[PDB]
């Protein structure tokens, strides 16, 4: 009996290769190739969104995360950044927030069909333990990922309008000018979906923990007066901070070869505050005094363009 | 008049919103097979028998007949005195006391084990239509306050 | 500056429970120096006990003449420093990059474990810590600020660490992540002068005054000096008893007026105005 | 001979004589009131305005005017939770009409929110407007699969001829939802290629979506869960307009051949069509809008989301599907088992799912006669009027090579089978 139960499909065919058209578009149109290996060595970096750079002209990522795992694997590979004009070459996705169970997102996701996928918390993990051995570029790197975080992600929640922050963490399409009537209800996600992903936002490098109280006030209808001024103290002293951070961080742009995960890390936070388009007092401090950090950051992205 | 001094699954289950006896509290099962529950069985002058159990996601005797209780598992032992419409009763496992009060109109009731264990089930019925329920678990040494609320309308 | 910075202590002392204001009366009363006590000049040290002042819900707060709250001991040094030699010494204008740095990496990495041991370890908790706020604040919160920061800590402390087989594992895993820490700590403090004491130190000290002083405190003082044995530990503990006795002379030091203390009244207004 | 109301307080008296003038006047004395009233008594129970329902009086009795259910739940680790729910009969003074509004809420702190809120009115003898105001949360594929949240509102409108030409109940149902959709992948990494595809990390994220339907039924069976005779129809027709169309069709046909419907011989057909009207094949469609096989409650011996293409091991549905299915019941022959709800189930389904390429309803219909995905087994069934218990054992005659096999026992629970 348990010998018949063994060949009870008559028949197997073959798999099925009918594919939807209209999805293998969508890919094509937010993947964005590495330049510079069989089928299952290469991985797919998934990201925010992506702007393009004004000067090199490449297609870098909007986040200060992104991009800084971004620039690593163009070092640890010898890759070249994407062009934005889009043979199994690595890629670089634009994703949703919520391709995770953890809703934050720089993820990479390794391989075909053996297909693991390494978390926010797990890459964040692998690139710290390329500088343990160092102790003392371990601080700076603790300071970068906590003071100028703390600083960049409220900046960016709530100094700079909603079409500023869909503009950079959001992988649905912008605004320009509604003339369509697909376009209302494309400008209306934008007004009923910033919240919630203002929210996930506030997940990622326990940003909710060492913050509770201005994340507490961000989930919520009404907010007070009293709730108003806290959150402008805390702030404000998130600001300060941030400029004596970046005031001291310029003595230490020596490079003698290939940048370091310090310097590919510095040069991330100041490549997405100078692509802000709002004058968000990080973007007005950076463009005015830390002028030697913008002419530093570009002298780090054109060992990686083409 | 049966109870196990319950407050499993009576005022624990009464803090949260959810989704020869054959007990079984069966949530649901697989498109394979699983039970995800509960499953309890049975067996004179005085009242007895011998239960099993199951669970997923215990085998015992039984003598009850003031009614006292009785279980041998691989061990319970409760009773319940009759004073008044006030009620009482003490159990013990192998360790708290009950304090049942069936009054009408405010049928409540509370425990207190010897330890930091202080359950005290309110349940009010202060009109013919409405009720309210509430839900002490004060763990003074655990220091939770587990409480819990509750009403139910019908004009 | 004249301003009025709040703490978590009761009398003559900061409480244990928390080791930004141990640090914090320690940095007031080791301003000596002559331009360092220009940072310190009319501070008015007050022990209100109660986190309704802060803009954000920790108590070291700084609130300065204006409503100008920094809150937290390395938000209120690196403001004192901005407003600008044995005990306490300010750090050259070419050391005040890794001086901000070792302060965050306490700040962060070893006050995290220190938040551990004073609310997870359940020898410590039970036999210490929660007896502790029956002193700091009024009767009927007596019960709810130690099991919200003990809620605090298990999701700060879940990454790294977490029935005999249970809790051991736990106090491995601990005990290999503060033994990296320090070691973090110490080999990234040696960059600096030696023989000084900064604002980063008083920082790491009060996280060794307060694990060192628990109910669990001598199985840490055991495993502590199998890594970095016995002439560092005995180093380490001589310089913080020297601070724990010293004299208050330096503290201006003030009572809770009807506006800071939070009594019953004023904790049901300051809960008012949230909404 | 004469028609009496008694009660009738809860409505309004010149709503309800349009319901009387339809069908108990106009009534030829003795040729059709039997069932002229008993249509009527069939109407108002489910038009929510009679909880129990010569001379013909209207034994009418009021439901409810609140039923609410509040209550809070604290446990001091901020983990409070509250509920609310009431399902209202407003009063028909101040609107006009028999209007039902419900409003269930919870909120958590630990658990997402739920918002359901509705309001059937009642427009006519025969019109239903029900507007669906909803806040949900729910999983798609499995617990640890994909998590979908909706927001938004839903129109919707009833119709159902009481009088046909030909109890064959007919009704057609239209409705516009606008909804915003969140979908978000819930699987971890460590069950690694499970929903993490190319085109399941490409799903993720909002959309905002307005569509407009159509479901037109023709019921003409004796029962509608535990049928012996007649068939179904049911026609149903979605658009997102400027985004996709989408119709199914579904054929049933129950027939019995023995005394005491003895052996019952059922057969379904499913098929179905999704359009994409999109400018070029931009802005595909959503997964959640594509057609799924396989399962308990369709193609049995299969896991449910067992068909179709993949792209790794993710069932990605498709553009078009056609399946079958033929049982027979037999009634527990044992001597005395019988007379009940209990029979003894030969089934046999089968298939086929596909993505189209959108080009033509001629090459369509040629990949759907290929190459079905059948399968058969034995089994036994209980047909309550409100549930239907099903505990097959079934083998997979052919099938392709990535399918979700499941040929062992399986256990089978719902309303709707193919």
């Not at chain 4, 979908?148 to 239209?174: M, V």
Request: aromatic content about 10%; charged content about 20%; overall charge positive.
């Amino acid at each position: 009996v348990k010998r018949i139960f063994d060949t009870f499909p008559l028949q197997t065919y073959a798999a099925q290769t009918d594919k939807d058209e209209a999805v293998a578009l969508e890919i094509q149109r937010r993947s964005y190739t590495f330049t510079e290996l069989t089928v299952e060595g290469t991985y797919k970096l998934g990201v925010y969104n992506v702007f393009l750079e004004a000067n090199t002209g490449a297609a870098l990522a909007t986040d200060p995360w992104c991009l800084f795992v971004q620039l690593a694997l163009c070092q640890k590979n010898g890759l070249v950044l994407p062009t934005h004009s889009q043979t199994c070459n690595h890629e670089m996705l634009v994703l949703s927030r919520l391709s995770n169970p953890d809703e934050a997102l720089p993820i990479l996701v390794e391989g075909y069909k053996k297909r693991i996928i390494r978390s926010t918390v797990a890459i964040s993990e692998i690139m710290r333990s390329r500088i343990l051995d160092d102790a003392e570029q371990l601080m700076y790197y603790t300071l970068l990922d906590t003071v100028l975080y703390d600083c960049w992600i409220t900046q960016i929640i709530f100094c700079a309008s909603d079409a500023q922050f869909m503009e950079l963490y959001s992988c649905q399409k912008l605004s320009g000018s509604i003339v369509t009537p697909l376009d209302v209800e494309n400008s209306l996600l934008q007004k009923l979906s910033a919240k919630s992903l203002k929210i996930s936002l506030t997940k990622r490098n326990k940003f909710q923990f060492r913050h509770r109280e201005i994340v507490k006030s961000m989930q919520g209808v009404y907010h007070n007066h009293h709730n108003s001024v806290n959150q402008e103290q805390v702030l404000n002293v998130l600001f300060e901070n941030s400029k004596q951070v970046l005031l001291g961080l310029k003595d230490m742009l020596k490079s003698d070869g290939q940048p370091t995960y310090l310097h590919l890390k510095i040069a991330s936070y100041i490549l997405c505050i100078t692509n802000v388009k709002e004058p968000i007092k990080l973007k007005t401090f950076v463009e005015n005094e830390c002028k030697e950090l913008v002419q530093f950051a570009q002298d780090t992205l054109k060992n990686f363009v083409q | 008049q049966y109870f196990f001094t319950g407050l499993r699954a009576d005022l624990n289950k009464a803090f949260s919103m959810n989704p020869v006896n054959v007990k079984t509290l069966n949530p649901s099962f697989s498109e394979k097979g699983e039970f995800t529950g509960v499953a309890v069985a049975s067996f004179p002058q005085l009242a007895l028998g011998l239960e099993t159990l199951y669970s997923r996601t215990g085998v015992s005797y039984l003598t009850r007949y003031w009614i006292f209780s009785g279980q041998l598992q691989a061990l319970i032992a409760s009773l319940w005195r009759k004073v008044a419409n006030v009620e009482a009763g003490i159990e013990t496992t192998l360790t708290t006391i009950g304090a049942k009060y069936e009054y009408r109109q405010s049928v409540y009731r509370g425990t207190l084990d010897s330890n930091g264990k202080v359950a005290c089930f309110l349940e009010r019925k202060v009109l013919p239509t409405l009720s309210v329920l509430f839900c002490g678990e004060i763990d003074h040494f655990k220091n939770d306050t587990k409480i819990g609320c509750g009403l139910q309308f019908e004009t | 500056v004249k301003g009025s910075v709040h703490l978590w202590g009761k009398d003559g002392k900061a409480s244990l429970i928390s080791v930004d204001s141990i640090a914090l009366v320690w940095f007031i009363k080791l301003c000596t120096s002559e331009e360092a006590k220009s940072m310190v000049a009319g501070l008015q040290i007050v022990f209100s006990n109660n986190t309704d002042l802060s803009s954000d819900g920790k108590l070291p707060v700084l609130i300065l003449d204006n409503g100008t709250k920094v809150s937290g001991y390395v938000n209120i040094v690196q403001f004192l420093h901005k407003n600008i030699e044995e005990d306490l010494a300010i750090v050259r204008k070419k050391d005040r990059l890794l001086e901000y740095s070792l302060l965050n990496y306490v700040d962060v990495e070893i006050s995290r474990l220190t938040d551990y041991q004073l609310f997870l370890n359940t020898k410590n908790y039970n036999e210490y810590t929660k007896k502790l706020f029956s002193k700091l604040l009024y009767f009927p919160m007596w019960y709810n600020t130690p099991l919200q920061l003990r809620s605090q800590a298990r999701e700060n402390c879940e990454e790294i660490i977490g029935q005999e087989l249970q809790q051991v594992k736990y106090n491995l895993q601990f005990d290999n992540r503060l033994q990296s820490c320090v070691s973090n700590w110490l080999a990234a403090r040696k960059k600096l002068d030696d023989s000084v004491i900064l604002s980063s130190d008083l920082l790491f000290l009060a996280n060794l005054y307060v694990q060192l002083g628990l109910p669990d405190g001598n199985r840490i003082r055991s495993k502590l000096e199998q890594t970095f044995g016995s002439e560092l530990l005995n180093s380490m503990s001589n310089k913080i008893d020297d601070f724990v006795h010293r004299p208050s002379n330096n503290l201006e030091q003030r009572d809770p007026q009807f506006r800071e203390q939070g009594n019953v009244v004023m904790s049901l207004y300051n809960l008012a105005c949230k909404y | 001979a004469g028609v009496v109301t008694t009660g009738t307080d809860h409505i309004d008296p010149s709503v309800l004589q349009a319901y009387l003038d339809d069908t108990i006047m106009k009534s030829i004395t003795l040729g059709q009131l039997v069932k002229n009233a008993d249509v009527l008594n069939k109407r108002l129970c489910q038009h929510h305005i009679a909880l129990n329902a010569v001379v013909s009086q209207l034994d009418i009795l009021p439901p409810k005017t609140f039923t609410a259910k509040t209550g809070t739940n604290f446990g001091n680790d901020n983990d409070a939770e509250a509920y609310l729910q009431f399902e209202k009969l407003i009063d028909k003074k101040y609107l006009k009409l028999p209007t039902r509004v419900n409003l269930e809420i919870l909120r958590g702190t630990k658990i997402h929110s739920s918002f359901l809120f509705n309001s059937y009115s009642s427009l006519s003898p025969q019109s239903i407007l029900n507007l669906k105001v909803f806040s949900q949360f729910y999983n798609w594929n499995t617990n640890k699969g994909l998590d979908i949240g909706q927001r938004g509102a839903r129109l919707s409108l009833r119709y159902e001829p009481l009088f046909l030409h030909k109890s064959p109940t007919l009704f057609h149902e239209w409705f516009l939802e606008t909804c915003w959709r969140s979908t978000k992948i819930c699987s971890q990494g460590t069950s690694a290629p499970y929903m993490y595809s190319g085109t399941m990390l490409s799903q993720a994220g909002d959309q905002l979506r307005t569509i407009l339907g159509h479901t037109f039924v023709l019921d003409k069976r004796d029962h509608i869960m535990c049928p012996t005779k007649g068939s179904m129809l049911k026609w149903s027709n979605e658009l997102s307009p400027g985004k996709h169309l989408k119709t199914q069709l579904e054929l049933n046909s129950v027939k019995s051949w023995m005394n005491d419907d003895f052996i019952t011989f059922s057969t379904t057909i499913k098929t179905g069509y999704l359009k994409n009207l999109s400018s070029q094949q931009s802005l595909p469609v959503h997964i959640c809008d594509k057609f799924q096989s396989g399962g308990p409650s369709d193609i049995r011996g299969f896991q449910t989301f067992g068909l179709g293409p993949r792209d790794l091991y993710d069932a990605v549905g498709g553009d078009a599907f056609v399946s079958y299915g033929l049982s027979v019941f037999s009634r527990l022959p044992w001597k005395k088992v019988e007379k009940s709800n209990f029979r003894l189930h030969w089934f046999f389904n089968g298939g086929k799912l596909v993505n189209h390429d959108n080009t033509s309803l001629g090459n369509c219909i040629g990949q759907l006669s290929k190459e079905h995905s059948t399968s058969t087994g034995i089994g036994l069934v209980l047909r309550h009027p409100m549930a239907r218990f099903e505990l097959n054992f079934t083998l997979p005659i052919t099938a392709h090579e990535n399918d979700l096999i499941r040929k062992g026992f399986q256990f089978g629970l719902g309303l709707a089978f193919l």
